[PDB]
Amino acid sequence: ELVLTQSPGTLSLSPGERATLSCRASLSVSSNFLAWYQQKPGQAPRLLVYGASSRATDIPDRISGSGSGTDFTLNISRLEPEDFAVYYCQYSDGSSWTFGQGTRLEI
Amino acid sequence: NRKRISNCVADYSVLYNFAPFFAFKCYGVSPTKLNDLCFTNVYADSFVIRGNEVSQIAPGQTGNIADYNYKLPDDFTGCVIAWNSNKLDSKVGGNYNYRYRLFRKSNLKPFERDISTEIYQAGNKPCNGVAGVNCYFPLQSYGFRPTYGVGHQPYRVVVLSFELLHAPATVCGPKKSTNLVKNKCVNFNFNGLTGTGV
Amino acid sequence: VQLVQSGGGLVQPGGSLRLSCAASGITVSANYMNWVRQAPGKGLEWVSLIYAGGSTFYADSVKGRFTISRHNSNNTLYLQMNSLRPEDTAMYYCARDLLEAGGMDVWGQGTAVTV
Numbered sequence: 001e002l003v004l005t006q007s008p009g010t011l012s013l014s015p016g017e018r019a020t021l022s023c024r025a026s027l028s029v030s031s032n033f034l035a036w037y038q039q040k041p042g043q044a045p046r047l048l049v050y051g052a053s054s055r056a057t058d059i060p061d062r063i064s065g066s067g068s069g070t071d072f073t074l075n076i077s078r079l080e081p082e083d084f085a086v087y088y089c090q091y092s093d094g095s096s097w098t099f100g101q102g103t104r105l106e107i
Numbered sequence: 108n109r110k111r112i113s114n115c116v117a118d119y120s121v122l123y124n125f126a127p128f129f130a131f132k133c134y135g136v137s138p139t140k141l142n143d144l145c146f147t148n149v150y151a152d153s154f155v156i157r158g159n160e161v162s163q164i165a166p167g168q169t170g171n172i173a174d175y176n177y178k179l180p181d182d183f184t185g186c187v188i189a190w191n192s193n194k195l196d197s198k199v200g201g202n203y204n205y206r207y208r209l210f211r212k213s214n215l216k217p218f219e220r221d222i223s224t225e226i227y228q229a230g231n232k233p234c235n236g237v238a239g240v241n242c243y244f245p246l247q248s249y250g251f252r253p254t255y256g257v258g259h260q261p262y263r264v265v266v267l268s269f270e271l272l273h274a275p276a277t278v279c280g281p282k283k284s285t286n287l288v289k290n291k292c293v294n295f296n297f298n299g300l301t302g303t304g305v
Numbered sequence: 306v307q308l309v310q311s312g313g314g315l316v317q318p319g320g321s322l323r324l325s326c327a328a329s330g331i332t333v334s335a336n337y338m339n340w341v342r343q344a345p346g347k348g349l350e351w352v353s354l355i356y357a358g359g360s361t362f363y364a365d366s367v368k369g370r371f372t373i374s375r376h377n378s379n380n381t382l383y384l385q386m387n388s389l390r391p392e393d394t395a396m397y398y399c400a401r402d403l404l405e406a407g408g409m410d411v412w413g414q415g416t417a418v419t420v
Contacts, residue, residue, distance in 0.1 A: 035406065035407050099349055
């Protein structure tokens with residue numbers, strides 16, 4: 001259903017810098033049902049935001065993530081060494097579902 | 108929304124003159140013989156639904172909106188009509204009147220409505236008080252945005268029901284009225300009187 | 306708050322495999338829960354939804370082969386794979402992803418499907 005684009009191929013992580021991760025939706029899609037979650041393969045993943053307004057728990061919530069239309073992004077001001085995992089953005093309608101291959105975070 | 112019809116007559120010609128409806132899913136009796144058959148009571152369930160949920164609103168399909176909020180019985184003949192009223196009401200910040208329930212503890216039988224104020228429990232602990240972690244009140248507001256395509260537009264849906272009873276029927280009106288020419292040898296059926304003359 | 310999956314292994318295509326999804330603390334049996342498969346070298350992809358009520362959602366590829374049922378005594382889900390295929394070599398994910406947050410995902414039993 002929904003088409004999603006997440007760029008680039010590889011990241012340029014260096015701790016102590018501001019980073020911008022953006023994912024683009026299909027047709028002016030809303031964000032109150034959009035969910036970001038962290039994911040590192042091998043174990044249980046971590047959640048980031050629900051409803052794109054208030055972030056999920058277990059995070060200090062310094063990442064500012066929002067958007068409108070087909071333009072959704074998150075800006076992280078302070079980087080931590082625990083962020084070495086790939087982040088996904090999804091949207092749910094209850095009758096249609098979508099997923100996206102995220103961008104690998106390394107140097 | 109849910110409604111019913113009293114003793115009168117409902118012509119669908121003026122309904123067909125209103126607007127080109129989106130659904131026209133009259134899967135029961137044929138639309139041509141709607142005026143030929145009539146019943147004692149009519150239920151009018153005229154409400155509004157999101158555009159992406161017009162697909163599963165049929166009795167043959169089910170979903171979260173169907174099984175928890177409003178369900179139509181498959182073993183029942185019905186005629187539904189729906190039209191797009193997205194431009195009729197639009198709010199830039201989001202329509203806050205179109206909140207819908209997320210979850211109820213048991214699945215809903217078709218043709219019942221239930222409103223309450225209780226908290227869904229997500230653990231072996233009471234939810235009499237207010238909580239926000241593993242004890243959630245089921246709340247879901249769409250927040251309709253005018254800057255969206257066809258998927259999330261408010262399509263107002265009118266559901267029309269019909270059933271037989273031991274009473275005489277109301278809404279079909281077989282009244283046949285002609286022009287009544289004044290000077291000719293013509294046939295007539297005045298109140299069931301089969302006769303000819305001038 | 307934490308979930309465990311029990312019963313996984315390695316079986317040939319064309320057989321039936323039973324797995325148990327049991328969580329502790331959260332009464333997950335009365336929630337919108339979902340089933341996810343994750344192939345190695347492939348991103349996460351939606352497979353199935355099952356509700357607290359009897360509403361079955363399935364993907365096009367899995368069709369009616371997948372079976373899910375909920376136990377009433379505990380927060381235990383019994384799920385059965387029938388007539389397995391070589392395209393289903395994937396790790397299993399069981400979760401209770403709802404429309405509020407869809408949070409607290411599970412590590413999941415890791416399996417591989419081969420003849």
